[PDB]
């Protein structure tokens, strides 16, 4: 979509992988603000609303927290210290054509600065003078709407880079989705610590003759003693019991 | 509800609308100059007419803004350039004489004819036929015929055409409430509205004329030196008591004396600074020529060229069927598209032209942060002199010996540098009086205080006085040989070449003081100094957004056009010329001796 008609789609109930972005070897503005790109994988907040729009190469600097300008003030304003990341890449091979790609529009004028995280969709014309315009172009109408023009011969500083904006904030909505956690390797016959999804403990593997039910994550036997778990990785049952101990 | 906020709204609308139309007109003009077909001519005139008509509509809308209350200078310069009516003041029956006459001038000049009268064997066009007979041959008889082969066969049919051009362009000044058309061209240098910084339109004629009384004594000694190695080849064949023929000064107009170097070499026993034989042993090509030029600039501190130029522009002469002209010109298509249009050759001139035409491209992106209406030079002399100061630096011996073109054992005595500096003086200093006289001639005839019967007797009497040339044949008033030049016929201001020299040496002294060079200006270098590169790019990037009279005060502190920091470059040359002319007859009076 265009800059003035940026969409906002929430990503939730599924795991979002940011590792593939690091080795994509295609982005040119892989910059993160307010958080390191690596450390936001394991931990993250909800409200993963993604904003997608088209920004010209020279207009990249305009789109940044605490930075004002033309696009940042009349099309989409990023709040200062915005906790998010911006990833941009060249789109000349697809978002360009000979003679100008007249498909992305933007707002050139506005009476007041845009509120951060606001989408402006209106046909209202700029009113700098006192006499309004009745639909006929004159000396004070100045139709703000204009069409971007991108060509394959555009300079590197003017190339249209396809960029998206990710927002991260913690609201009352629970059950946020973050990056996946790498699984360790199996270890057999050793008093080893284990930390499953929610619970952790120490013990060793020992043979058992009793099968556990398949619709429980963990179980206990006596005196709130958790001694049974069910790995969901492959549903392969493994027996875990506290390892031997005693006095000398 | 303020006029200040109303101008920024209008220029923001024009900048995005015009840059879409300008990129279509520049792209259409580029394909016409590379691939000529029958359909490509109709495609270019269709896009070019609606682009020219768009500026006609925007100039009328900006007219209703009053100019007496805009204290901001950035938008004042934009509104002054946008409100130039141009051809809109003329009526429809008079505006049709512009496009009709100007297209007739280009087609008439494009007719090549060297077939001999009463001897019709064959004749080819101008470029392969006319240029070889003036630049290579050394025979007096046919060149005297060749002098009359163009000023009596081409200029005779311009007398009714050029006079119609100079009687309607002169009328625009009364329609624009100016004095004359010569004063209209001085409006680009005119600055008003600033206290103590005002530049009158009429003060420039006096200041230019006041600076000409020190150019003359330099040109007196320059002409005296060059006359001693030419009278050697013709002792008793030309008399050494009068002036020189017009058809023996290198070119048709005698502007550049480069072709007299083979005839007038000072000391040909030692080899010249020539590396044409040096590049062919290592098999140098067009690609390796421009790569070492690029790494010279990035060592200074300027940004390198973008990736959308090497795979997009053309470098050599492509194909065999494409007979498109490749005159060295700089292309600014807009929207980040920049091209160089020339045919490369392994010659002296094309290697220097490769340096000359790339500098305009490097200047165009420098003021890329400026708005579109201010995306230009400060005046017409800035964009030409900036592209030539790096030509002086590339000619230095450390850079020629740095790449490996020159021999590793090349001594640097007295005579290897006096020969180079005086040859540069003939192509730079020698062209200053020719540039000043022609623009001085055009101003009074545009002013109108020259009758019809006094064109030739005043034009010829100053060529004999200032330049010092005796006419090889008398010419009456029906000839129109001053209108044959490229710039005068196509409405080009020739004053941008006089201010080119005075600008390209103001920057040299300013940058050498920034680099803290210990020595004179002839041995000074600009390279290997990132402090001077940031100093220049700070001054290159202003463009037309600031007045040019403020641009001088930002570097030298003198608001006028100073001539003193140009003689200091040639003090080693001037003191030798003063000693060499102790006995020669320096200074000519009026001379009717040969053709009384
Ligand atoms: C998830 O469980 C399925 C069940 O067979 C298994 O095939 C798959 O490999 C498991 N995922 C991983 C990452 O091992
Ligand atoms: C180049 O010119 C030739 C003839 O002059 C024409 O046939 C050809 O189509 C042109 N190429 C393009 C890309 O227009
Ligand atoms: C003057 O106009 C320029 C327009 O480029 C603007 O940037 C600057 O802020 C203005 N200054 C004042 C004092 O109005
Ligand atoms: C330009 O032309 C308009 C009418 O077309 C006129 O009102 C205006 O005064 C002219 N301006 C100049 C500077 O000649
Ligand atoms: C131009 O210079 C920049 C900065 O040193 C560099 O990253 C870039 O690769 C250079 N361009 C080329 C074509 O080498
Ligand atoms: C110095 O200049 C003179 C010219 O008068 C020349 O003869 C001499 O060779 C030069 N010096 C050297 C070392 O060549
Ligand atoms: C200037 O820079 C060039 C870079 O190639 C270097 O070769 C040369 O030695 C330098 N000269 C001086 C005097 O620093």
Q: Annotate chain A with three-state secondary structure.
A: CCCCCCEEECCCCCCCCCHHHHCCCCECCCEEECCCCCCCCCCCCCCCCEEEEEEECCCCCCCCCCCCCCHHHHCCCCCCCCCEEEEEEECCCCCCCCCCCCCCEEECCCCCCCCCCCCCCCCCCCCCCCCCCCCCCCCCCCCCEEECCCCCCCCHHHCEEEEEEEECCCCCCCCCCCCCCCCCCCCCCCCEEEECCCCEEEEECCCCCCCCCCCCCEEECCCCCEEEECCCCCCCCCCCECCCCCCC
B74 lines ligand 3 (CB under 6 A): yes
- Give the residue, by CA position, lying nearest to ligand 3 atom 4: B74
Experimental technique, in short, is cryo-EM
Chain B contacts of A153, Cβ < 8 Å? Answer: 308, 312, 333, 335-337
Pocket of ligand 2, beta carbon within 6 A: B 35-37
Residues 6 or more apart whose CB falls under 8 angstroms from that of B404 comprise B278, B282
Q: Report DSSP state, residue B303.
A: P
- Alpha-carbon distance of B191 to B275, in angstroms, equals 48
The full 3-state SS of B535-569, as one line of letters, equals HHHHHHCCCCCCCHHHHHHCCCCCCCCCCHHHHCC
Chain A contacts of B83, Cβ < 8 Å? Answer: none
The CA-to-CA distance between both ends of chain B, in Å, stands at 75
- Alpha-carbon distance of B179 to B173, in angstroms, equals 6
A233 lines ligand 1 (CB under 6 A): yes
At which residue do the structure tokens 């463009």 appear? B543
- Distance of CA B528 from the midpoint of ligand 7 (Å): 6
At which residue do the structure tokens 């083979």 appear? B262
- Residue of chain B with shortest Cα separation from A109: B9
Ligand 7 test: best mutation among B398, B405, B532, most atoms within 8 Å of CB? Answer: B398
Task: Let me know if B357 is a catalytic residue.
Answer: yes
B243, B472 in Cβ contact below 8 A? no
What radius of gyration do chain B's Cα atoms show?
25
- Distance of CA B303 from the midpoint of ligand 5 (Å): 8
Chains A, B: CB contacts within 8 A come to 60
| Residue B151 marked ligand-binding | yes
Residues 6 or more apart whose CB falls under 8 angstroms from that of A216 comprise A228, A230
- The verdict on a CB contact (< 8 Å) between B20 and A99 is no
- Alpha-carbon distance of B23 to B46, in angstroms, equals 14
Which among A128, A142, A158 has CB closest to B335?
A: A158
- Residue of chain B with shortest Cα separation from A101: B20
- Give the residue, by CA position, lying nearest to ligand 3 atom 11: B72
Which H or E run includes B43? helix B38-61
| Residue B459 marked ligand-binding | yes
Q: Which atom of ligand 4 is nearest the CA belonging to B59?
A: 1
Min Cα–Cα distance to chain A from B292, Å: 22
B471, B595 in Cβ contact below 8 A? yes
A178, A44 in Cβ contact below 8 A? yes
- Alpha-carbon distance of A172 to A178, in angstroms, equals 16
| CA proximity to A142, closest of A151, A129, A154, A153 | A129
Chain B contacts of A142, Cβ < 8 Å? Answer: 9-10, 13
- The verdict on a CB contact (< 8 Å) between A155 and B12 is no
A86, A31 in Cβ contact below 8 A? yes
Chain A contacts of B338, Cβ < 8 Å? Answer: 155
Q: Which of A104, A153, A154 to mutate to test the interface with B (most CBs of B within 10 A)?
A: A153
B77, B374 in Cβ contact below 8 A? yes
B162, B482 in Cβ contact below 8 A? no
- Give the residue, by CA position, lying nearest to ligand 3 atom 6: B74
| CA proximity to A72, closest of A83, A64, A80, A81 | A64
In 10 A of CB B410, how many CB atoms? 12
| CA proximity to B221, closest of B501, B563, B470, B583 | B583
- Give the residue, by CA position, lying nearest to ligand 1 atom 13: A233
């Amino acid at each position: 979509a265009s800059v003035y008609a940026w969409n906002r789609k929430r990503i939730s109930n599924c795991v979002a992988d940011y590792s593939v972005l690091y080795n994509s070897a295609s982005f040119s503005t892989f910059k993160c603000y307010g958080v390191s790109p690596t450390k936001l994988n394991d931990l993250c907040f909800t409200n993963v609303y993604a904003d997608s729009f088209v920004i010209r190469g020279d207009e990249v600097r305009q789109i940044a927290p605490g930075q004002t300008g033309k696009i940042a003030d009349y099309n989409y304003k990023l709040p200062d210290d915005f906790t998010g990341c911006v990833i941009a890449w060249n789109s000349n091979n697809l978002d360009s054509k000979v003679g100008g790609n007249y498909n992305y529009l933007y707002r050139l004028f506005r009476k007041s600065n845009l509120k951060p995280f606001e989408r402006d969709i209106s046909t209202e014309i700029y009113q700098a003078g006192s006499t309004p315009c009745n639909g006929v172009e004159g000396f004070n109408c100045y139709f703000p709407l204009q069409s971007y023009g991108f060509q394959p011969t555009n300079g590197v500083g003017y190339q249209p880079y396809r960029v998206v904006v990710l927002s991260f904030e913690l609201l009352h909505a629970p059950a946020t989705v973050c990056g996946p956690k790498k699984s360790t390797n199996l270890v057999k016959n050793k008093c080893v610590n284990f930390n499953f999804n929610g619970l952790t403990g120490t013990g060793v593997l020992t043979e058992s003759n009793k099968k556990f039910l398949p619709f429980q994550q963990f179980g206990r036997d006596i005196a709130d003693t958790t001694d049974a778990v069910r790995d969901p990785q492959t549903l392969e049952i493994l027996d875990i019991t506290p390892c031997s101990f005693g006095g000398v | 509800s303020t006029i200040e906020e109303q101008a920024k709204t209008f220029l923001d609308k024009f900048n995005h609308e015009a840059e879409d139309l300008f990129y279509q007109s520049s792209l259409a003009s580029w394909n016409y100059n590379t691939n000529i077909t029958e359909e490509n001519v109709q495609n270019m005139n269709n896009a070019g007419d609606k682009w020219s008509a768009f500026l006609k509509e925007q100039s009328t809308l900006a007219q209703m803004y009053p100019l007496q209350e805009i204290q901001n200078l950035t938008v004042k310069l934009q509104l002054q350039a946008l409100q130039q009516n141009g051809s809109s003041v003329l009526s429809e029956d008079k505006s049709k004489r512009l496009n009709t006459i100007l297209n007739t001038m280009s087609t008439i000049y494009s007719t090549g004819k060297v077939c001999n009268p009463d001897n019709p064997q064959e004749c080819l066009l101008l470029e392969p036929g006319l240029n070889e007979i003036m630049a290579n041959s050394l025979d007096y008889n046919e060149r005297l015929w060749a002098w009359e082969s163009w000023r009596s066969e081409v200029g005779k049919q311009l007398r009714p055409l050029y006079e119609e051009y100079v009687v309607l362009k002169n009328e625009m000044a009364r329609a624009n409430h100016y004095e004359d058309y010569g004063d209209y061209w001085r409006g680009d240098y005119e600055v008003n509205g600033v206290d103590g910084y005002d530049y009158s339109r009429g003060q420039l004629i006096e200041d230019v004329e006041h600076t000409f009384e020190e150019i003359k004594p330099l040109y007196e000694h320059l002409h005296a030196y060059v006359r001693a190695k030419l009278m050697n080849a013709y002792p008793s064949y030309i008399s050494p008591i009068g002036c020189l023929p017009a058809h023996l000064l290198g070119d048709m107009w005698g502007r550049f004396w480069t072709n007299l170097y083979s005839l007038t070499v000072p000391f040909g026993q030692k080899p010249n600074i020539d590396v044409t034989d040096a590049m062919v042993d290592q098999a140098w090509d067009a690609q390796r020529i421009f790569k070492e030029a690029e790494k010279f600039f990035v060592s200074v501190g300027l940004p390198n060229m973008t990736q959308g130029f090497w795979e997009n522009s053309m470098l050599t002469d492509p194909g065999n069927v494409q007979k498109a002209v490749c005159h060295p010109t700089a292309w600014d298509l807009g929207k980040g598209d920049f091209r160089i249009l020339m045919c490369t050759k392994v010659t002296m001139d094309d290697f220097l032209t490769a340096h000359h035409e790339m500098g305009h491209i490097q200047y165009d992106m420098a003021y890329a942060a400026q708005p579109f209406l201010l995306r230009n030079g400060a005046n017409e002399g800035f964009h030409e002199a900036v592209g030539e100061i790096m030509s002086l630096s590339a000619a230095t011996p450390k850079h020629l010996k740095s790449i490996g073109l020159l021999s590793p054992d090349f001594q640097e005595d007295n005579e290897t540098e006096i020969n180079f500096l005086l040859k540069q003086a003939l192509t730079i200093v020698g062209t200053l009086p020719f540039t000043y006289m022609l623009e001085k001639w055009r101003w009074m005839v545009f002013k109108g205080e020259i009758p019809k019967d006094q064109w030739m007797k005043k034009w010829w009497e100053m060529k004999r006085e200032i330049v010092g040339v005796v006419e090889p044949v008398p010419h009456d008033e029906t000839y129109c040989d001053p209108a044959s030049l490229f710039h005068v016929s196509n409405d080009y201001s020739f004053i941008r070449y006089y201010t080119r020299t005075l600008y390209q040496f103001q920057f040299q002294e300013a940058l050498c003081q920034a680099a803290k060079h210990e020595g004179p200006l002839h041995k000074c270098d600009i390279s290997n100094s990132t402090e001077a590169g940031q100093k220049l790019f700070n001054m290159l990037r202003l463009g037309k957004s600031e007045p040019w009279t403020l641009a001088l005060e930002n570097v030298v502190g003198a608001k006028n056009m100073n001539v003193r920091p140009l003689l200091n470059y040639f003090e080693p040359l001037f003191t030798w010329l003063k000693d060499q002319n102790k006995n020669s007859f320096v200074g000519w009076s009026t001379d009717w001796s040969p053709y009384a």
